[PDB]
Amino acid sequence: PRRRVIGQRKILPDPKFGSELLAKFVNILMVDGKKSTAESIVYSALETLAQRSGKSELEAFEVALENVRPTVEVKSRRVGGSTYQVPVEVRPVRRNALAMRWIVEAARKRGDKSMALRLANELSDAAENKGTAVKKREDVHRMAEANKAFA
Amino acid sequence: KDFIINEQIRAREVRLIDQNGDQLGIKSKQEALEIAARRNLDLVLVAPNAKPPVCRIMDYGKFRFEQQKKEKEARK
Amino acid sequence: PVIKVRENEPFDVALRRFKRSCEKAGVLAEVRRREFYEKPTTERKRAKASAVKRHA
Amino acid sequence: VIQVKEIKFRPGTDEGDYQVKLRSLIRFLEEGDKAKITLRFRGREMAHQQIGMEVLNRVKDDLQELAVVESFPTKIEGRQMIMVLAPKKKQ
Amino acid sequence: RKQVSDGVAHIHASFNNTIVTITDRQGNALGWATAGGSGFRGSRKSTPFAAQVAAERCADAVKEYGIKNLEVMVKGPGPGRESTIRALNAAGFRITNITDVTPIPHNGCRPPKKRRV
RNA sequence: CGCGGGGUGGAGCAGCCUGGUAGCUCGUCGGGCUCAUAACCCGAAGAUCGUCGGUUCAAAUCCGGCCCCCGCAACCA
RNA sequence: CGUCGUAGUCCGGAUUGGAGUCUGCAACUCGACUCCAUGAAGUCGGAAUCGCUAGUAAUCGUGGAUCAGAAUGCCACGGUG
RNA sequence: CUGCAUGGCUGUCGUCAGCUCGUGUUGUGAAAUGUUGGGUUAAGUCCCGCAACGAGCGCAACCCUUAUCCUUUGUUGCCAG
RNA sequence: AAGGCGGCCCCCUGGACGAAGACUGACGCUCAGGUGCGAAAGCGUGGGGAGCAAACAGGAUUAGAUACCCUGGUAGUCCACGCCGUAAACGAUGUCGACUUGGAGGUUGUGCCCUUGAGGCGUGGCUUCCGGAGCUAACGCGUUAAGUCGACCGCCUGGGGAGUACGGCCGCAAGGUUAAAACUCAAAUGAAUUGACGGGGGCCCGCACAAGCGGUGGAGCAUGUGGUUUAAUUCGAUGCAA
């Protein structure tokens, strides 16, 4: 990206709900190009989350994502022999991506029996803004507010 | 040497000794912190492994400065 | 750079004003300039160099 | 307690350079550390018959006042030989 | 225990640290908090975020008097010049005036040598 | 029978009067940095804390013996 | 579709015993593979470090050269992605 | 045996954008300019500018393959009626 | 004049420049020797001492670290009166005079124009950036010459040895000034050119970093190498490029 700027591939929407957002999610959860088996785990987790937690499947997703979404972050930088930490205000599209990514990662780093149950309980926790993924947003802010001076 | 103080303390309850040696008894960390605050002093965990942990009310900065002073002077 | 917020002006706008008053006033530049001793020969050297660059 | 600090004495470290850092090595010992001499030969498992035990031995012999050495090691391990030096032990 | 409702936020923002002090018009200290003593050291201590929680922690050791309006006095060039001010305003504070009071000698004392790092 | 200070990992220490998994340096073996080496940096190995009896919840640190090193001491023509 | 239900396990396959197959005058040193039994370390790897910008990475099988026999290497193929 | 006597082959910086010549002109001369600049390109790619005007090797093109279609040919491939 | 000179006010004082006309009548230029001035550091006596800071102490870094960084800190940096007389004391360009095309500015006098606008037309002093001829090894200089000429002075004669030794003069000292030879080498040097290189600089590229996904470093096995072993463990490949 020295010279060549680019657009971004605009992936197809989630097959079940027609959501580009959930397509960004299944892909992020996907491993070894196992798309078939990835969306299976995302839905069953949404189905587990939907059925027994007040429904509104897309909305349930947002309530949880709303909580792990980070408004600002820090970008490392090396000036006069010094590695300064510059807090940057982060753009909406990626805001979702980090939010989704930390939810997925916290799910695999969990004790429950399957990825679907884990994913479901991560969303639930995030929905109540608690657990690992939310905590990942908070460290980002503690780390950001600290270097507030250099913005 | 270094002691953890004030909010760094994790103990639920501590045995409290004030700045003059008065044994205040077993207090919740919250109450111990209140007593230290009203006296404009610090709550210092002087005996982390005692049962319950022992805290002393004192000015931590003044204490630490004097300790370092002592060490330096005796070696120069 | 003294600032006084006017009524029904958001805290942000007033702040942006303040930061531009200091950008205008040269505070941080000034503080940077004095953090460390500069030899007279050195500031004469700086002065020529910027005269020179200030030809396009 | 007694710490381990260290000094080195490479080959080509003679009087000049040397006893200046025998002064440095006093300093280590005299903090109350166990000052470990490391030789670092231009050499081998037997580099020298010269490099080490002029230096080391004269470091002991000059510092002998304040410090003594634990061992005069003369078993090199690698291309470098630790002579270990301590405070002179009160009997 | 007492009442003010009208204060001034003096923030000392050096490069290594940023000390926040809340006070009345007279200049009498009502409360204070620092970044270095809010759980931040060295590389993190000297950040705008550390100055922010300093401003936050300070607003908790002062509302015993129930301040409701204040002026801000920004001193020094470090971070937390600005981010400190923000946290104050979000903590429930009406900002009346902002003033930079960073001292500028009319060329008096010779400063320390340049650091050859 | 005669004083001093110590015993912890290969060597030297810290953890001591403030009794709850013994950590900190040089070496050891790896990894990183370099065209390469020195130097430096990330790291892992490495222990009945001398040895016993007492004493205790658990004693590295708690006492006293056995024992060892050094300290000066004693042999200082 | 069913089972195992977070365990050093219905994970993992090292190692070793026993008995065999085929190539080849000949499988002790040293071949490949099979049957039965065995069931190591390993519960995600310090400092440090590599590849990859799209039908790529990742993952899944497939074939070939050499070659009596001896591929986890090498060269090539497409599947999902 | 010598790759420190060699041919041929190969790695490598690196498919990086470089390497040069004639005539002109500048400098006593070694040399320079061209190929010092402003933009832009994967690129010494291209364009303006220019005491240079032009040219050659390398860049690109011509080559293989892949993506759409047309004509020819239907067996061992094909099966719309 | 050079060294160098910066808050404001007064006092004492040097130089420069312009306008107009009067006066003196070549009274001028240069200058070995001589005299005076001359940054900083340094020296002597007595003051002064906030900040800074040789030395020195302590903390760190490092293989070492008598350093670079940090915490301190004495002389010194400041004043008076003396000394020293040196700097990349530089425009690395001696002083004075005459002559030779131009453009854009800065600064500072002065004559003129409905002052009718913060201007319009001239005429001196200083100054900055380009550039013409000419000059120059080139770089560059170019009416403030490194051009074209003249007057006088200082200085150079290959590198090292050496601005050293000896002698003289000078200084409280540190030291300064004048200034050799033996010996040794075939070079030393200047400017510019093509590369290469840069953790000197500028601009720019590459999965180079950054953004990501999956790994190697741990384990067991396959495999290559080193090492070690052996009668032999055949020969070669060894930083990226074994």
UniProtKB/Swiss-Prot annotation, chain A:
A Gene Ontology molecular function term for this protein is:
mRNA binding
Q: Does the keyword Ribosomal protein apply?
A: yes
Kindly list the biological process annotations in GO that this record carries: cytoplasmic translation; negative regulation of translation; ribosomal small subunit assembly; translation
What are the protein's UniProt keywords?
A: Ribonucleoprotein, Ribosomal protein, RNA-binding, rRNA-binding, tRNA-binding
Annotated effect of mutating residue 35 to A/E: Defective in ribosome assembly
One Gene Ontology CC term in the entry? cytoplasm
Q: What is the effect of changing residue 115 to G?
A: Significantly decreases affinity for its own mRNA
* Presence of keyword RNA-binding: yes
Q: What else is known?
A: The strain K12 sequence is shown.
Q: What does this protein do?
A: One of the primary rRNA binding proteins, it binds directly to 16S rRNA where it nucleates assembly of the head domain of the 30S subunit. Is located at the subunit interface close to the decoding center, where it has been shown to contact mRNA. Has been shown to contact tRNA in both the P and E sites; it probably blocks exit of the E site tRNA. Protein S7 is also a translational repressor protein; it regulates the expression of the str operon members to different degrees by binding to its mRNA.
What family is this? Belongs to the universal ribosomal protein uS7 family.
User: Can you state the subunit structure given in the record?
Assistant: Part of the 30S ribosomal subunit. Contacts proteins S9 and S11. Cross-links to IF3 and the P and E site tRNAs.
In Swiss-Prot or TrEMBL terms, this protein is called Small ribosomal subunit protein uS7
- The source organism is Escherichia coli (strain K12)
Q: Supply the gene name.
A: rpsG
UniProtKB/Swiss-Prot annotation, chain B:
Subcellular location(s) per record = Cytoplasm
> Which top-rank group of organisms is this from?
Bacteria
User: Which residues pair up as cystines?
Assistant: none
Q: Which family does it belong to?
A: Belongs to the IF-3 family.
Primary role: IF-3 binds to the 30S ribosomal subunit and shifts the equilibrium between 70S ribosomes and their 50S and 30S subunits in favor of the free subunits, thus enhancing the availability of 30S subunits on which protein synthesis initiation begins.
Quaternary structure (record): Monomer.
The identity of this protein, by name, is Translation initiation factor IF-3
The species this protein was found in: Geobacillus stearothermophilus
Swiss-Prot record, chain C:
Q: Which GO terms describe its biological process?
A: cytoplasmic translation; ribosomal small subunit assembly
Keywords recorded for this protein, A-Z? Ribonucleoprotein, Ribosomal protein, RNA-binding, rRNA-binding
Molecular function (GO) terms for this protein are:
rRNA binding; structural constituent of ribosome
Task: Write down the superkingdom of origin.
Answer: Bacteria
Where does this protein have compositionally biased stretches of type Basic residues? 45-56
A GO-annotated cellular component: cytosol
The entry sums up its family as follows: Belongs to the bacterial ribosomal protein bS21 family.
On subunit structure and binding partners, the annotation says: Part of the 30S ribosomal subunit. In stalled ribosomes contacts ribosome rescue factor SmrB.
Summarizing the function annotation, the protein's role is: Probbly involved in recognition of ribosome rescue factor SmrB in stalled/collided disomes; fusion of protein fragments to its N-terminus decreases ribosome rescue in the presence of SmrB.
What name goes with this protein?
Answer: Small ribosomal subunit protein bS21
Native organism is: Escherichia coli (strain K12)
| Parent-record interval covered | 2 to 57 of 71
Swiss-Prot record, chain E:
Gene Ontology biological process terms from the UniProt entry:
cytoplasmic translation; translation
| InterPro entries with a match to the protein in the record | Ribosomal_uS11, Ribosomal_uS11_bac-type, Ribosomal_uS11_CS, Ribosomal_uS11_sf
UniProt keyword annotation of Ribonucleoprotein present: yes
Q: Name one GO molecular function term.
A: small ribosomal subunit rRNA binding
Per the record, what is one GO cellular component? cytoplasm
SUPFAM superfamilies in UniProt: Translational machinery components (SSF53137)
PROSITE patterns per the record?
RIBOSOMAL_S11
Keyword entries, A-Z? Methylation, Ribonucleoprotein, Ribosomal protein, RNA-binding, rRNA-binding
Please verify whether the record's keywords include Transferase: no
Q: Which Pfam families match?
A: Ribosomal_S11
Describe its partners and assembly state: Part of the 30S ribosomal subunit. Interacts with proteins uS7 and bS18. Cross-links to IF-3. In stalled ribosomes contacts ribosome rescue factor SmrB.
- Tell me which family the UniProt entry assigns to this protein: Belongs to the universal ribosomal protein uS11 family.
Q: What else is known?
A: Has been predicted to contact the N-terminal domain of IF-3 based on footprint studies; exactly how IF-3 interacts with the 30S subunit is controversial.
Give a short account of what the protein does: Located on the platform of the 30S subunit, it bridges several disparate RNA helices of the 16S rRNA. Forms part of the Shine-Dalgarno cleft in the 70S ribosome.
* Protein name per its UniProtKB record: Small ribosomal subunit protein uS11
- Naturally occurring in which organism (per UniProt): Escherichia coli (strain K12)
Which taxonomic lineage does the organism of this UniProt entry have? Answer: Bacteria, Pseudomonadati, Pseudomonadota, Gammaproteobacteria, Enterobacterales
